[PDB]
């Protein structure tokens, strides 16, 4: 029965080790992402949460019919 239907314990053991590593990495990545989102939303210095401002390319820098703009 053991020869025909199953494997040794080392296979399940090391598959479990691989599964555990994947899951623990995913967990720490999730926590880190939550912290990064908190900081990027509070500070606005990150690539995320960039709210539009006015394009400076719309300003007209030509003499404006009076000297003081």
């Amino acid at each position: 029965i053991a020869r025909t239907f199953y494997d040794g314990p080392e296979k399940n053991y090391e598959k479990t080790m691989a599964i555990l590593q994947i899951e623990a990495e995913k967990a720490e990545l999730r926590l880190k992402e939550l912290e990064v989102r908190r900081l990027m939303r509070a500070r606005g210095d990150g690539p995320w949460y960039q709210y539009p401002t006015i394009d400076k390319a719309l300003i007209d820098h030509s003499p404006k019919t009076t000297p003081d703009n």
């Binding site: 053991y13 080790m17 623990a24």
Partner: protein
């Protein structure tokens, strides 16, 4: 027989007396024993002889599995899942081996109580004391862990006990 270790499963030298008949009457037990022997024990023995003749022709063996010693839960850092996994598997195997040790000691105790007859209260004191020592140790290690036990909870229990013992010894030294 020699199949099992007589050091783990010991028994006394098995003193039995010799028959000292006191009457001319025939003992029906011995006649019944001869009848039983020559009607039951000889055919069974022959059948077993044939069975073992067929067994010897095809002889194959199996091997007890040996497990290395990996680092335990004390030398795993807090979030290292692989060290924790191997330590927890090792702790579980050790828990199973300790259960079997207590089982062996209990088997000794029971065999002694049965064997010693009317004198079990005095003749099985060493077996009882041995069980008491083993039971105390096993209780300290695993009792009150609950279901969902783990090596970390066993370590926390040990550390609590060690703190209490250290503080007791320290205040005894001030006495």
């Amino acid at each position: 027989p020699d199949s099992w270790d007589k050091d783990v499963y010991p028994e006394p030298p098995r003193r039995t007396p010799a028959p000292a008949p006191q009457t001319s009457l025939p003992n029906p037990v011995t006649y019944l024993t001869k009848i039983f022997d020559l009607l039951v024990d000889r055919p069974v023995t022959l059948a077993r002889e044939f069975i073992e003749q067929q067994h010897a022709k095809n002889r194959y063996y199996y091997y007890h599995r040996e497990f290395r010693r990996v680092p335990d839960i004390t030398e795993c850092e807090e979030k290292d899942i692989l060290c924790m996994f191997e330590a927890e598997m090792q702790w579980r195997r050790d828990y199973k081996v300790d259960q079997e040790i207590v089982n062996i000691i209990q088997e000794r105790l029971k065999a002694c109580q049965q064997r010693e007859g009317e004198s079990y209260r005095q003749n099985c004191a060493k077996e009882l004391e041995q069980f008491t020592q083993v039971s105390k140790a096993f209780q300290d290690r695993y009792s009150d862990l609950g279901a969902h036990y783990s090596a970390r909870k066993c370590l926390a229990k040990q550390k609590q006990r060690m703190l209490a013992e250290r503080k007791a010894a320290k205040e005894a030294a001030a006495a």
